[PDB]
Design a protein around this nucleic acid. Structure first.
Ligand SMILES: [K+]
Ligand SMILES: [Mg+2]
Ligand SMILES: [Mg+2]
Ligand SMILES: [Mg+2]
Ligand SMILES: [Mg+2]
Ligand SMILES: [Mg+2]
Ligand SMILES: [Mg+2]
Ligand SMILES: [Mg+2]
Ligand SMILES: [Mg+2]
Ligand SMILES: [Mg+2]
Ligand SMILES: [Mg+2]
Ligand SMILES: [Mg+2]
Ligand SMILES: [Mg+2]
Ligand SMILES: [Mg+2]
Ligand SMILES: [Mg+2]
Ligand SMILES: [Mg+2]
Ligand SMILES: [Mg+2]
Ligand SMILES: [Mg+2]
Ligand SMILES: [Mg+2]
Ligand SMILES: [Mg+2]
Ligand SMILES: [Mg+2]
Ligand SMILES: [Mg+2]
Ligand SMILES: [Mg+2]
Ligand SMILES: [Mg+2]
Ligand SMILES: [Mg+2]
Ligand SMILES: [Mg+2]
Ligand SMILES: [Mg+2]
Ligand SMILES: [Mg+2]
Ligand SMILES: [Mg+2]
Ligand SMILES: [Mg+2]
Ligand SMILES: [Mg+2]
Ligand SMILES: [Mg+2]
Ligand SMILES: [Mg+2]
Ligand SMILES: [Mg+2]
Ligand SMILES: [Mg+2]
Ligand SMILES: [Mg+2]
Ligand SMILES: [Mg+2]
Ligand SMILES: [Mg+2]
Ligand SMILES: [Mg+2]
Ligand SMILES: [Mg+2]
Ligand SMILES: [Mg+2]
Ligand SMILES: [Mg+2]
Ligand code: NA
Ligand code: NA
Lengths: 205, 144
RNA sequence: AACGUGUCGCGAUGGAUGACUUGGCUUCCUAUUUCGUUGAAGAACGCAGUAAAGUGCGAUAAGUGGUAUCAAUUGCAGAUUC
RNA sequence: CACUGACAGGGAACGUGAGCUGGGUUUAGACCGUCGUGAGACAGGUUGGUUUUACCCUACUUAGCUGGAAAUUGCGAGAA
RNA sequence: CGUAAAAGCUUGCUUGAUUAACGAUUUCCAGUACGAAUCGAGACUGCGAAAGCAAGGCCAGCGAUCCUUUGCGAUGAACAAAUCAUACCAGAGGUGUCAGAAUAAUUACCACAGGGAUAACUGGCUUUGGCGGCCAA
RNA sequence: UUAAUGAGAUUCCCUCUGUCCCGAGUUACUAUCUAGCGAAACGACAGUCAAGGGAACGGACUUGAAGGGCUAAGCGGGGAAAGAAGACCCUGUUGAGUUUGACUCCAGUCUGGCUCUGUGCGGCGACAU
RNA sequence: GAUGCAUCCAAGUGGUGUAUAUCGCAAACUGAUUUCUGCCCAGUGCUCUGAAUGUCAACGUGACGAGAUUCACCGACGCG
RNA sequence: UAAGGCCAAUUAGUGAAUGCCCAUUAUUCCUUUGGUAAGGGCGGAAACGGAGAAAGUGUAGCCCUUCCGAUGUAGAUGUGGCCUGGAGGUUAGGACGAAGCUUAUGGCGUGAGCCUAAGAUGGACCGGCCUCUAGUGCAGAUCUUGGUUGGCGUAGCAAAGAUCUAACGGAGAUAUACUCAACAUGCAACGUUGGAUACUGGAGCGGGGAAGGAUUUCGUGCCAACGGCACUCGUA
RNA sequence: UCGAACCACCUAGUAGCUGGUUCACAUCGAAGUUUCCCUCAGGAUAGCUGGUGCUAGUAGAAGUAUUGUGCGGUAAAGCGAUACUUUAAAUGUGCAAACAAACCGGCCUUAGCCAACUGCAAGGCCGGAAAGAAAAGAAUUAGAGGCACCAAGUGGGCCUUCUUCGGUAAGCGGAGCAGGCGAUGCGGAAUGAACCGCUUAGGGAUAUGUGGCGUCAAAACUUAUGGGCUCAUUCUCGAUACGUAAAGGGUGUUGGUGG
RNA sequence: UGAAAUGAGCGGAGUAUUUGAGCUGGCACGGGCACGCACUCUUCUCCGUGAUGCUCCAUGUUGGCGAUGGAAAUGGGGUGCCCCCACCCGUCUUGAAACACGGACCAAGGAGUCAAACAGACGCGCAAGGGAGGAGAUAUGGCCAGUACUUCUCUCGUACUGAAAGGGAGAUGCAAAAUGCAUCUGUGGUGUGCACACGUCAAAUCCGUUUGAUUUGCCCAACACC
RNA sequence: CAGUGAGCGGCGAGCGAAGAGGGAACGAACUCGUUGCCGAAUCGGGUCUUACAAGGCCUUAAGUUGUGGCACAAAUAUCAUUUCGUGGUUGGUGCAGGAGUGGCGAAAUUCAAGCGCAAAGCAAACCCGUUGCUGAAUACAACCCUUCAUGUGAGUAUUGAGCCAAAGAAGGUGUUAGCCCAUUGAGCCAUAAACCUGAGCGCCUCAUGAACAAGCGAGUAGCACUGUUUGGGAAUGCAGUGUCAAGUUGGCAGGUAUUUGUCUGCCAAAGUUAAAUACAGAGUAGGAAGACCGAUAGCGAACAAGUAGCGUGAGCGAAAGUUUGAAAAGCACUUUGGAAAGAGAGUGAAAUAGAACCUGAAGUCGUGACAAAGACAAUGGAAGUACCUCCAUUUCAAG
RNA sequence: GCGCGGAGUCCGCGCACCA
């Protein structure tokens, strides 16, 4: 007899199980450790091949969208041409010295642009560019001592010489001000909400 | 493990606990949730009231991110202040500042008695919470 | 008595069990890894001193040439860098 | 209808189908009447339509061999 | 069943056959629903000089989800206006197989899973119809 | 209604006869006995009766009667003998063949519109004017 | 009476009766000859005529509305 | 002169409660098992008849004492309960004989089972204990596959008429212990040639072809199997 | 191979229907009934059963009495017709019988009733009393109360006692109360699921129940120093309940009443 | 068979003790006392052995047989016999020994499994918090498909309610404000209610303490009413 | 995210995704058409340069009904040349090193004790112990006693000494092997092209880097009817037919239809493109494994298995371990028999290992010995007794 | 339920059909 149980919805009514008459529709993960080993091995080989260039190109810092992830930060796809021009860089030349370029992204605020311009300048101050011809060194290219003392940044994100994403600092303790003791903010918040909510009906009349 | 199951205990008992008169047949009641309005009506009505019917307005493309709005109560605020600032805190002096949206909260509710006065920054607040914290000596600052 | 019944010793018929395993099943990996009118895959007929099947091979037919090895092949015959 | 002294009534898985027979009843073919739009129906009529096996046990009928009174043993001894 | 200065008959005035904040309960009963019924609180009223009586005709006379439709007072997610659609609450359109699928025949050309849970034959029980006897008549 | 025809269904007559009264005798091949060869079906265990009670028709139970062992040929009373998951009847939210004035549909057939689609001449309208 | 009737095929400049042409071809019923084959058109079928507006579909025409719409008019076989 | 039917006794007008027989019941004694079980002991007294003495659900139960219950289909649950293949640990065995197999081989256990003995058996692997794991226990499914078996030396091997005789051939005979001339102690059956007797009866057990078959054709050998009897013969 | 051929595949098609389902001991132990269902050979649901517990171990106990206090219209009785009813049992059935209860006097509070409150209603606080329930037949208990969670089988019954409805009757159909068998042997009735006795760990002794004591067959080796009655010739005197013969006759024999 | 013999029964001490029957001197019993209540015959009496022993086992008399063997004895195993007892297994069914179905013999094979969602009970870790997964990093480059390490995220929970626009829970005191004021070591109250503390009562006790009942305080868990 | 407080659904059974967040990958980007400026500067074919050169010379052959160049959101603009350099992916000639591939390539006992029974033990954690010590097999061989005989395959086993290990890691060898054999490193040698190396390094030819004003893809998008598909709901994608645009003042998308204003993102109707992902009955060349199966199992197939065999055909489809022994040493020879075989003899540790030959169960059958026994079917329970017993245990003298 | 007629009622006709 059924007693007091949850009403089941287990969704297993298609031919998913392989048997004598059905091929099935199934996916197992029995190759997971072998694939992990293979990916790490390929990464180390690729680093050795591209030595001394860093394994990963330089990327900008962006803000996450929506009101739920508003306060977070991460790495985006590439630098915008406006940031690159503020840093003094032809995008087509920046593509050849390990900088990612994204022409779709816009800059709607100043602070987001300033952060990425600083990232670009910090990177450019630490670049060590090798000469095309060992005979002749033209303009800002490394001498032979640096080619001797060249190293590879193998970090997982390519942030060795720019650092990780930065965050807004934390407010220090302070005292409560007179107006803060005086009047509440609840009424102000409700007034703004009601103004927007009943806009239109308050204006037609 | 197979050695702990009831089949091991039933070896030698020909019927395996299903009886001689009524047997262990295939599907004597129908399959799944069949019969919920006809021959399983009593079970459905006694254990799952409300199961059949419609209610309310529709909302075709629901996104949960714009509705994100977690809450925290006044008598739980000490979960967000490190133990060194909490003891130093005192009404009429210097108070720790709590940023709710960085700890994962959007609204401050006013249940209970506040234990450590502080300055709280929040997107939303209830009226009783605002009154209580002002009386205890802190403040609320609206943020976005 | 005879036929029949029962028990023990020894034999026959029969091919179970145990031990054995160059086979199966299942999982994972590595590549200058993907056939054919320049006639493929498949199908047929043949080839050894002795040769039914199977294996290999095509009238140059249980194999020609090259490189590396280093004294066999083997049921019976036959004949060192050849 | 006729004979006789007389042509009483019943039971035995309504005795008796590996005893028979197969006329009736009860498949498929076909005709008639009535009924049904119709496919078809009829406790109505009609004609045509495979009847399998005993060498086993018992019973019965006949036909042979042979032990045995402590009814096979005890030496356990009873004479119309 | 009950009822006599009435619960019957005649008569005067009336609409308590309305509304009734999701109050509690009985019958069926799993102590679920539906139908019917009992005791109430609030509004607005009727009749009566008054105390009072009355939210139908005591007790059978009725109906889920979804859908349609009417009465009453938030939404259409980037904003705004007017239409249109939808939503909360209360009714109405129906399921008589009445706790609610949308449903005609035939098989002797026939099939399958089962049933002695169930007919057609013997047997058993009981009666039948047979059938004349025994006292008196 | 019908001459001729019929391995069609029916009744009577003549001839004839072992169909019968009522059975008897004979032949060939079997059965029977021998040499050689050599199966199957079936097989819970078994296998003498009377009465009783019992799932109301016992080989096995109760009370009585019989019953020495082993064999050959026959036989069809019993073994509710063998043969096949009853073709009759009922049940199942099981089929299939067939029918229709059953529910829901699809081809086919007919009918209208648009399209394929051009050039002139008249006539009748309707919208402007 | 071939611009046909019956009719195959998923389809086409596709197929069959048709190498044909009413003394032909296709679809039904009855069942030699002889002698005959009555009455019934109400029902159900089949078939023939119009009322251009009895009824209806798409299309088409006019009006209302900011518009999605709404209303009206027209409308063939068939049915009656 | 009941061993029948009604009534009434208990060894009989003698003088004082029970004539006799038979239960898985009653009373009582011994042992097991389980409890909503009930008590006690467990700092080794000392010395030197025997040993032991665990703070404990469950054992070969830590040890004593005490009281009460015990059957059961469908069904539930427990078990330091039994058994099988493999893994992690630990501890052992084996050519002076492992696994497997055999039994009037006893011993232990209420039981599932465990252990020893003997092999006039075998010839290379394997046992106990704690954890882990599963394709883990059979009497029956008109169950599956292999092999046996009564019936049984039985039913039968009965259409197409049929063979006989001598010589030769062949291991297929004329095959013997005393005694015995020969019968009564080697039967039955075969190929070839000659002779006899019959059959097919020209719509033929005659002579040639198609379809189908594919060496069955010819000669020399051979006789294990096959030619439902037989063979010295054969389409083997 | 045909009222829809054959081959392979979807396909291990579905089956409320038939058949099967492999070791031991131990502690417990049912149901064939309720409500709803295209529901009658099936389910869900409550009940009956097992497991796990929780809680302050005698508590809010009872298939039973006694005393007090309520309910009833059947049997019997009587007279519509020519059984309806005043009356009215036996057997039943509801409540109470001193520890969260009830009794006697302060006081607080209520926007409860009343013309009003020093009355009444309700909730509390402070005190008193307490054969802790006498005597009069004046209870008893192998008498620890309450509260949850998880889940099985079952939903074909049948027999008997006393009531009965249908039916001519039935080893027939349908019901009420209780006990049984099913699920269970053992001892008796010669035999029998259900009758009588008794209900079950493995064994002794003693004594009994039902039933017996001529033999079969244990017991009066055919008891008594008890009384009556009975003769029966082809199924036949008779003799263990449940269980398988009537009217009418008889000088056969034994007695009783009145004449 | 006396390895703690508890005895009216084995031991020590004397001769008396006190049970009845007859017969004896206020109240009761009846209309006197058959002899109720109170103060010669007939029998044996008093005293004694604790466990420095928690448990188990070890102790008489007289014969037969057995002096090392083809021994004796006890138990087990096998086969026959006698007296008694005793219907064929599995299954469906109210009911099977059935004239109800399956059942010739043996070997080997043969049936509640794996996955996923939820729940209850029991074991383990942490706790207002718990825990990943995917992936990376370096020990690490048959051992090594294991083990050791990791962020910031995600998920379940710490808060619910409304169809929705939305809103969102402490206590006490003053007070009555349609966002009142003041304090912050705290069960919102009432009834029932472990343990502990404070006293009482009854029973037993080398007798210092137990075993029960009960008053008062606080009442934990929990239940009932607000 | 999410079996979803989305949504679809006789709103029943059931079905059911997307954006955001942590990550894998990532040198990731480019080409036509159109517009403007040029206008054969292009392509094929001969022929010559070491060359079917991205090179010269010649070609009406193709092509103006348009091949090709330059610029355009990562842009700043058209040309203008000669300077220094660059290009191993212009073509022709050469030259290296590496990786890969193939061959070659390591240690330590056949150490000492001898045969049925000491090539075996005891000395109680460790140490004594390099030490001590010692024989219950004077064996056993089928009712019991005497005589004669016969009976142990190969040491990877035991015991005692000793070595190797950067190698203890499995396989082979007549019983169980670190040291009997193979295998395992360090290292050495040899290679057609291709692959990697200051985009390896020279020449000849051939290319070429830096200073010095308009427009943007038409029977397309949309709309109507019908059909289908989706979670997509007054219509998520698509198909047929009818109808059929706009001009960046424009168009498409913003999950409820219409009309009207705003706002945000993007620019369809042409094309190419590595990696991270699949291999659910593929294949080539190599490798590594397993708490899996163990000859009725595991693939149908451990074997001359998709074989033998069956069906007109499509198709269907087995059984069967060759496992004698360490080695064929595979039974010479005598004797009986027509032969098959039998009786002896011999090999071997073993012939009851004699060729489909390890072990060799159950069931069924033959034979020898014994026990009995009526018809009571047989089997079965309980309690004794007669006879037997290759079984166990206990007792034998003061007990 | 929608349109026509003929005497909100009825009568015919032809159409429509998700509680
Ligand atoms: K015969
Ligand atoms: Mg239940
Ligand atoms: Mg298949
Ligand atoms: Mg059971
Ligand atoms: Mg069931
Ligand atoms: Mg049932
Ligand atoms: Mg709605
Ligand atoms: Mg084997
Ligand atoms: Mg390919
Ligand atoms: Mg060959
Ligand atoms: Mg050639
Ligand atoms: Mg009122
Ligand atoms: Mg609707
Ligand atoms: Mg019946
Ligand atoms: Mg017969
Ligand atoms: Mg016969
Ligand atoms: Mg006990
Ligand atoms: Mg029990
Ligand atoms: Mg299994
Ligand atoms: Mg078996
Ligand atoms: Mg014959
Ligand atoms: Mg003949
Ligand atoms: Mg002739
Ligand atoms: Mg023959
Ligand atoms: Mg045929
Ligand atoms: Mg199945
Ligand atoms: Mg099937
Ligand atoms: Mg069954
Ligand atoms: Mg019980
Ligand atoms: Mg059934
Ligand atoms: Mg039953
Ligand atoms: Mg009984
Ligand atoms: Mg006797
Ligand atoms: Mg039975
Ligand atoms: Mg919650
Ligand atoms: Mg161009
Ligand atoms: Mg465009
Ligand atoms: Mg278009
Ligand atoms: Mg769909
Ligand atoms: Mg592409
Ligand atoms: Mg196989
Ligand atoms: Mg062998
Ligand atoms: Na008719
Ligand atoms: Na296994």
């Amino acid at each position: 007899p059924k007693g007091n149980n949850a009403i089941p919805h287990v969704h297993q009514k298609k031919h998913w199980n392989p048997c004598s008459s059905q091929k099935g529709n199934v996916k197992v993960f029995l190759n997971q450790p072998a694939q992990k080993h293979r990916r790490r091995r390929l990464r180390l080989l690729k680093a050795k091949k591209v030595f001394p260039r860093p394994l990963k190109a330089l990327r900008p810092q962006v803000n996450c969208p929506t009101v739920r992830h508003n306060m977070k930060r991460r790495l985006g796809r590439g630098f915008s041409p406006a940031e690159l021009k503020a840093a003094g860089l032809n995008p087509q030349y920046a593509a050849t010295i390990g900088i990612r370029v994204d022409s779709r992204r816009k800059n709607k605020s100043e602070e987001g642009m300033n952060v990425n311009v600083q990232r670009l300048k910090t990177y450019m101050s630490k670049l060590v560019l090798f000469p095309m011809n060992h005979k002749k060194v033209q303009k800002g290219e490394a001498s032979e001592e640096e080619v001797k003392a060249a190293t590879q940044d193998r970090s997982r994100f390519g942030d060795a010489a720019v650092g990780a994403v930065v965050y807004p600092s934390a407010e220090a303790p302070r005292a409560v001000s007179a107006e803060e003791k005086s009047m509440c903010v609840y009424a102000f918040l409700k007034k703004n909400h009601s103004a927007v909510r009943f806009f239109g009906t308050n204006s037609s009349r | 493990p197979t050695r702990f199951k009831k089949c091991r205990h039933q070896r030698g008992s020909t019927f395996c606990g299903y009886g001689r008169v009524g047997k262990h047949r295939k599907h004597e009641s129908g399959r799944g949730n069949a019969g919920g309005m006809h021959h399983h009506r009593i079970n459905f009505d006694k254990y799952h009231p409300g199961y059949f019917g419609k209610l309310g307005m529709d909302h075709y493309h629901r996104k949960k991110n714009p509705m994100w709005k977690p809450t925290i109560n006044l008598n739980n605020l000490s979960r967000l202040i490190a133990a060194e600032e909490a003891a130093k805190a005192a009404k009429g002096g210097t108070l720790p500042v709590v940023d709710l949206q960085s700890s994962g909260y959007a609204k401050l509710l006013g249940n209970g008695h506040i234990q450590v006065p502080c300055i709280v920054k929040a997107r939303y607040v209830s009226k009783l919470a605002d009154k209580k914290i002002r009386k205890a000596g802190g403040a609320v600052v609206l943020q976005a």
